[PDB]
Design a protein around this ligand. Sequence first.
Ligand SMILES: Nc1ncnc2c1ncn2[C@@H]1O[C@H](COP(=O)(O)OP(=O)(O)O)[C@@H](O)[C@H]1O
Ligand SMILES: [Ca+2]
Ligand SMILES: [Ca+2]
Ligand SMILES: [Mg+2]
Lengths: 154, 362
Amino acid sequence: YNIADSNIANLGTELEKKVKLEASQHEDAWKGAGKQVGVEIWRIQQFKVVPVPKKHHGSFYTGDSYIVLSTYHPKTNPDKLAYDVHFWLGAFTTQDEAGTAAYKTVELDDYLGGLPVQYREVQGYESERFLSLFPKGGLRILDGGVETGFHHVE
Amino acid sequence: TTALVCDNGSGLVKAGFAGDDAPRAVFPSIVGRPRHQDSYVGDEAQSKRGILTLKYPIEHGIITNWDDMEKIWHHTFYNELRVAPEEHPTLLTEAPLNPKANREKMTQIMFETFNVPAMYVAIQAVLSLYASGRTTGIVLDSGDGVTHNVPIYEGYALPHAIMRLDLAGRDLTDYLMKILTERGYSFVTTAEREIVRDIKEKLCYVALDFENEMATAASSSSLEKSYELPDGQVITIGNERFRCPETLFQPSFIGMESAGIHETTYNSIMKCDIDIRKDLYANNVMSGGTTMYPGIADRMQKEITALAPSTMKIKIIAPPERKYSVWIGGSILASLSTFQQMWITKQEYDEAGPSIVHRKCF
Ligand SMILES: Nc1ncnc2c1ncn2[C@@H]1O[C@H](COP(=O)(O)OP(=O)(O)O)[C@@H](O)[C@H]1O
Ligand SMILES: [Ca+2]
Ligand SMILES: [Ca+2]
Ligand SMILES: [Mg+2]
């Protein structure tokens, strides 16, 4: 094929990254994120990225989807920051919530320069790294969740 | 302000409003004119096909009749959705590996003829992946044209590994028309192509083992099904049920030397960096109407298993709503203010012209 003559000729470029970095500047949830070691959590609520209060971190509604940014010091330099970004998809989350959580994970990755490593965490399938984020007893699944942002077409 | 989402397939328009869970208008991407030598569009053309010749302005994802495509878009806005397009930011979609001029002209028409306030052209497979709740995976999208494979890692499509096959549902319909002649049936005209399309969608399936299935079909009538035609005649079909979609796996059935959809999926994965291949093999997402044949996911599982390393964990994801996954992913993304921030505005188009689409839409 002729990629260069095609509609994918500008994929993979610095220009693509630049445009997406700019878009990520328009989400208030990312301001201040990833500035120190710890865990930050947001829940998708009718398409919006909404902070979860620290006192609830580790409790997740089975009906909902979340973004969890774990900031830590890498082995290479104890004074710098690295990132794992997990998106957690409840067993009963709706398609709008999971799709928004996926897209906004990519956006937070863009905001942080690509550095976050992404992990998709479906309820019951959480990775070893996700299980290691919460202290003993800290990971709890709650019944229910917030309403879908979709309008149902009858 | 509500954005419109329009997934212009080769075969079907899927159109509606961002934030809805499904497209509110789904209709054939066709313009009909009198078969006896002014025009009709979509469902109404299909209804009166008895006296019309039907033409698809899109073939293999590429607009080949711009005047008729403008009729389709006008009908979508004014007659189906009943909206004024100058009031709605609009998300359109496209197959990958199209010539750049296709989206330049889409952009020009949307701004200069329909006066949309803003617009974006998205790659279909990327929308499907987000609809599935993933940022990494490999999408196999097959509609009425252009089967494509798009591997995506951390939300970015990997352009060097994208594959395209200009073999999809329309080619399968045409092949079913051809092989039904062996039974003595004659399906030839554009209206008859639409009947055969319906037979295909209702009765075809992918055999798990093609040669075994051929032998089963000769041993007894156990695989036969009947179908009532619009004139009331009842026909019978047998091994055509599975020979038709077998073409996806054996493109030589229609004289193409191409790799089939299993081997192309595998080849796309093998063009990606080795360390991400396990995640692609475990996340093969199917989208589009031509992935709806019963048996296709199991046949894909079998065929990719045969090509891949013997310990590779392989999973085919086949969402039940996958006829609409591209549209749904668009509905989700177009509900996000940061996604809309990237859209081309009317003022940007006025100042930059069609070239701007390649600098904003990824
Ligand atoms: N159940 C089915 N089995 C096989 N093919 C199907 C089925 N449903 C739809 N199709 C085929 O899928 C195509 C339409 O699917 P779609 O994804 O809307 O295509 P496009 O996006 O190219 O318009 C047509 O070729 C149609 O006949
Ligand atoms: Ca919910
Ligand atoms: Ca990253
Ligand atoms: Mg399509």
